[PDB]
Each structure stands twice: as structure tokens, then as C-alpha cells.
Design an enzyme around this catalytic site. Structure first.
Site, mmCIF file in Angstrom:
data_model
loop_
_atom_site.group_PDB
_atom_site.id
_atom_site.type_symbol
_atom_site.label_atom_id
_atom_site.label_comp_id
_atom_site.label_asym_id
_atom_site.label_seq_id
_atom_site.Cartn_x
_atom_site.Cartn_y
_atom_site.Cartn_z
ATOM 1 N N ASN A 9 27.768 76.907 26.888
ATOM 2 C CA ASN A 9 26.705 77.224 25.838
ATOM 3 C C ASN A 9 26.973 76.440 24.396
ATOM 4 O O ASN A 9 28.148 76.786 23.800
ATOM 5 C CB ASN A 9 26.851 78.795 25.487
ATOM 6 C CG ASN A 9 25.714 79.091 24.556
ATOM 7 O OD1 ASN A 9 25.049 78.411 24.083
ATOM 8 N ND2 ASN A 9 26.105 80.456 23.997
ATOM 9 N N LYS A 11 25.526 76.556 21.999
ATOM 10 C CA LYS A 11 24.866 77.063 20.987
ATOM 11 C C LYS A 11 24.159 76.052 20.127
ATOM 12 O O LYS A 11 23.312 75.419 20.166
ATOM 13 C CB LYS A 11 26.138 77.943 19.879
ATOM 14 C CG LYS A 11 26.803 78.870 21.055
ATOM 15 C CD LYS A 11 27.656 79.635 20.133
ATOM 16 C CE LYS A 11 28.774 80.164 21.143
ATOM 17 N NZ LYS A 11 29.394 81.391 20.305
ATOM 18 N N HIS A 95 22.232 86.622 24.840
ATOM 19 C CA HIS A 95 23.609 86.364 24.335
ATOM 20 C C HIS A 95 23.721 87.311 23.041
ATOM 21 O O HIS A 95 23.027 87.726 22.395
ATOM 22 C CB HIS A 95 23.383 85.031 23.821
ATOM 23 C CG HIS A 95 24.789 84.490 23.449
ATOM 24 N ND1 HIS A 95 25.257 84.487 22.298
ATOM 25 C CD2 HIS A 95 25.650 84.026 24.245
ATOM 26 C CE1 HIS A 95 26.629 84.083 22.086
ATOM 27 N NE2 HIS A 95 26.855 83.517 23.447
ATOM 28 N N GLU A 97 24.747 86.890 20.123
ATOM 29 C CA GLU A 97 24.275 86.465 18.847
ATOM 30 C C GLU A 97 22.663 86.884 18.843
ATOM 31 O O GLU A 97 22.374 87.144 17.705
ATOM 32 C CB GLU A 97 24.612 84.748 18.841
ATOM 33 C CG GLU A 97 26.124 84.614 18.307
ATOM 34 C CD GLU A 97 26.582 83.147 18.972
ATOM 35 O OE1 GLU A 97 25.691 82.621 19.327
ATOM 36 O OE2 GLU A 97 27.773 83.132 19.124
ATOM 37 N N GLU A 165 30.389 89.313 27.858
ATOM 38 C CA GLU A 165 31.044 88.978 26.318
ATOM 39 C C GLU A 165 31.993 89.921 25.580
ATOM 40 O O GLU A 165 31.360 90.869 25.177
ATOM 41 C CB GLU A 165 30.114 88.468 25.355
ATOM 42 C CG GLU A 165 29.050 87.166 26.139
ATOM 43 C CD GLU A 165 28.012 87.245 24.749
ATOM 44 O OE1 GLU A 165 26.799 87.643 24.957
ATOM 45 O OE2 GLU A 165 28.133 86.320 23.806
ATOM 46 N N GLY A 171 36.055 86.957 16.926
ATOM 47 C CA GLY A 171 36.341 87.014 15.360
ATOM 48 C C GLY A 171 36.750 88.284 14.685
ATOM 49 O O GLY A 171 36.568 88.500 13.551
ATOM 50 N N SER A 211 36.472 84.154 24.779
ATOM 51 C CA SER A 211 37.311 82.631 24.308
ATOM 52 C C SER A 211 37.852 82.017 25.667
ATOM 53 O O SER A 211 38.894 82.540 26.046
ATOM 54 C CB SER A 211 38.409 82.964 23.325
ATOM 55 O OG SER A 211 38.968 81.844 22.786
#
Lengths: 250, 250
Positions: A9, A11, A95, A97, A165, A171, A211
Site C-alpha cells: 500500500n 498510500k 483501510h 485511515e 491492522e 504511532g 509494521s
């Protein structure tokens, strides 16, 4: 046996020059056969034509999203039938996001998955829980709810790959272990077995979308219920080739 | 004098074959000079490369949307700097369909406009009121609030075109008259004069984004404060050429 699956991906990243360099690097790669690993690369919409025209024919291209239904008066959106028309075989849907930043609901995602499949696309459907949700002991409640919204709308799973995910590690300063990944993949597959069918649980790829890098890919891929990866930032890098090569652990 | 401007918003429509037919028809058109009319065509993202590569060089291409800030981890989105890299000069922002269906706020739209301009794009910024808002007597309250959100974030108006969309006439059974369009355009220009500057008011194109076709383009285009059109469905049709030809009425 489930074929190992590695998706990249990109992005919201890329320029013509960078895309040329990324594709050239992939084109020169020597990796396991198409019978051993299924490789999908996902550029932004505006680079789908360039990538489809220049990428090695044994790797496949995905869009990063599509619209929930037939095209028409939806300024800015790209319909599933457009992607089919341009011979783009895959699409990423749901996704993290888009769920979080663009407020896509589980039901919205489910309707997109159903529509994309009906048009003939293959779908990487994404699920995952937040740090607040994991800490609340709700990881499987959340992942099952997201998967159920898709399951309620999809009767045929052949062209679906599920991506888990661990947003809680994205983060957040938390790191996800291979053991933690395996736990969720195992419980999700058990859920499919109990709530869809034993056949669907046995044959559906569930790939890890946390990750992933050159350093940890063999350790993750060797987990029993991990069938590959949805790679983020490494997918822009030569390191993506090492992640594809992790298929050899299977 | 303000250069007449005709934009064609294809919305979520198109196949490779239909795009070829549309572009060929435009390429064969004989219309007023580039000094008399500025023509912009806006396909879905995935057809921007095909259109940019095949459309006559004196017509310009626009994206139908872009992201609110720099690219990165925004799966599915297309950044303004990507569009600049691909030599796509224009973008439509704040279209009523994105405000309503995708819930873009006036502030979100304002931030997109500012970011797009900062990256070097030219922007068609859309505003307009609903039937409920018009019936409540709030037309100019709403259009001014939407425009203020953009004005508060924009330092240079040279590369902005404002499109007024009479959303109140979109599938409500109401029809907008040329007199009604002219009233809003005049009041909006007066708002720019008082609240931005007389120069910005005098030089900024305000184009009409209601129902435009071959039948009504001359009467609309002849209004004192209408500087052209943002065309919807006619933009897919040969009739778009007649709408471009309305520039001669000025």
C-alpha cells in the site's frame, strides 16, 4: 493450502520519477514464483495507468479505494466498474485511515466490498482495533463486528483477502509482537469458521497489516495463521522485495 | 474584462472507450480563441493521464478533488502536489456532492483551497445553498459563510474561480431562472468587493454551476455577473461545444 499474499500500500505517495524508480526496482527483482506468492502493488489513483503499463505482468495492481455503488453524480469518486474497465484487478477497502480520518463506517465498508466483488474486483478488506479498544479488552469484539458487517453483505468469499491492522500499535509507541499478531489471526479465523463456514475459514487469506519490514518479515510470516502482509511504508522501498521473499518460510 | 470560463465536470463517469469518443469530439471542435474563453475538462482521477495525453493542448484538465494537506498516510487520497507533478493544472473543490454526501465542511473546503493554491494549482471553488436554506431566506447568508471560509484562508485570488451551485434546484423539482442566477452572482461579487477588495471582485470569475445545456447557455452567459459555467452532464456530450461557444455572447 492458502497461497502467501503480499500487498504493498503506497498510500498517498508518489511522483512520476519515484514511481519509475520503484517499478524498475520491482521489475529487476528475483522472487518466489507466482505459485508461491501473490504480489499486489497499490499506487494512488492517478498512477494506476503508469504502474499498470510498466509493472511486470506477474505482479498485480490494486486501487486504494473505490465508491460504494454504481457511478453517476459523485464528484471526486472512482467507481468499481471504472477499475474493471482499466483492467485493475484488486482494490483495498476499509483501510484504517479511511475508517478513522474519512469516517467510513463498517456498514459503508461492507457495502463497498459487496459492490466491488459484484463488479468482478478482488478485495483486500481491512479490519483492526484502536489502542483504546484493545485496552478495553474489546479487540475481538471490534474485529468481529467489522468482519460481520462484511460477512452480512458478502455470500461468496473466494476473491476476498482480510487484512488485520493493529491500529493500537500504529504511532502509539506500542509495538506488536509476532505472538500478538498470531493470536488475532487465529481468533478471527475461528470466527469465520463459526460464523461463515469451515471452508471459508480454511481458504481465506488473513494477512498482517502492522509494521512490516525486512527485519521482522520472516518472523511474522512463519506464524501459523498469518498468510502474508499488507505493507505500508516499506512498499515504497527496495525492502519490499525482502518482504515478498518471506514467502519462502511457508 | 474577465475571461469567460467553461469547466466540464464529468463526475463519476467514464470508460476508456467513452473518454476516447469525448476527447475526439472536443479535438475536432472549432470554438472561440483561448483569449476569449478558458476551457477546463474534469475526468475522474484514473482517466487524468489518458485525457492529459490526448486532449488538445489549448484545453486544460482538472481533478475533481484533492486532499486537504501534504501527502503521506492517507490511503485512497490524491494530494495537490501529485496533481502538480502530473501537470494537471486545475482542481474542483467543495462541490455540493462532496459537501453533502462526503460531509466536507466549509472549513475543510477552505483549507483544501488554500493548500491547493499553495502547491501551484488553479482552483474552481464551489458554493451554494439548499432548498431549505433558500426557503428560510438564507441564500446569501449561506453563500457568504461558505465564501468567507475560503476567503479567510486565501491570500491570493488570481488563480481562483468561484462556482455557484443552486443546490436548491438540484432534483427538488425547482428550476432556477437566469434572473435568479444573476441575483446571486451580483450579490456574491458585491460581497467580494466589500469584504476582500474591489480589485478581487472585479477580476474573479464567478461561474454558474446549475443546469446548463445548449438551450440555456446564451441567456445565462449573457448575465452581467455570470462569467461562464461549471457544466455537469452536458460535459459528456457534444453539446458541451455549444456551451463553450456561448462565450461569444460577451
Amino acid at each position: 493450502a492458502r497461497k502467501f499474499f503480499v500487498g504493498g500500500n503506497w498510500k498517498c505517495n508518489g511522483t512520476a520519477e519515484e514511481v519509475k524508480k520503484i517499478v524498475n526496482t520491482l521489475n529487476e527483482a528475483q522472487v518466489p514464483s507466482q505459485d508461491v506468492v501473490e504480489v499486489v502493488v497499490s499506487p494512488p489513483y492517478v498512477f494506476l495507468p503508469l504502474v499498470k503499463s510498466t509493472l511486470r505482468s506477474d505482479f498485480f495492481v490494486a486501487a486504494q479505494n473505490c465508491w460504494v455503488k454504481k457511478g453517476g453524480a459523485f464528484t471526486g469518486e472512482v467507481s468499481a466498474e471504472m477499475l474493471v474497465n482499466l483492467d485493475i484487478p484488486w482494490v483495498i477497502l476499509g483501510h484504517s485511515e479511511r475508517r478513522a480520518i474519512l469516517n467510513e463506517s463498517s456498514e459503508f465498508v461492507g457495502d463497498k466490498v459487496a459492490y466491488a466483488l459484484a463488479q468482478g474486483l478482488k478485495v483486500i478488506a481491512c479490519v483492526g482495533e484502536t489502542l483504546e479498544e484493545r485496552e478495553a479488552g474489546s479487540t475481538m469484539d471490534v474485529v468481529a463486528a467489522q468482519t460481520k458487517a462484511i460477512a452480512d453483505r458478502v455470500t461468496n468469499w473466494s476473491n476476498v483477502v482480510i487484512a488485520y491492522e493493529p491500529v493500537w500499535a500504529i504511532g502509539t509507541g506500542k509495538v506488536a509482537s509476532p505472538a500478538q499478531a498470531q493470536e488475532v489471526h487465529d481468533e478471527l479465523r475461528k470466527w469465520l469458521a463459526k460464523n461463515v463456514s469451515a471452508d471459508v475459514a480454511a481458504t481465506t487469506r488473513i494477512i498482517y497489516g502492522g509494521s512490516v519490514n525486512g527485519g521482522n518479515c520472516k518472523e511474522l510470516g512463519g506464524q501459523a495463521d498469518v498468510d502474508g502482509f499488507l505493507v505500508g511504508g516499506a512498499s515504497l522501498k527496495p525492502e519490499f522485495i525482502d518482504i515478498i521473499k518471506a514467502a519462502e518460510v511457508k
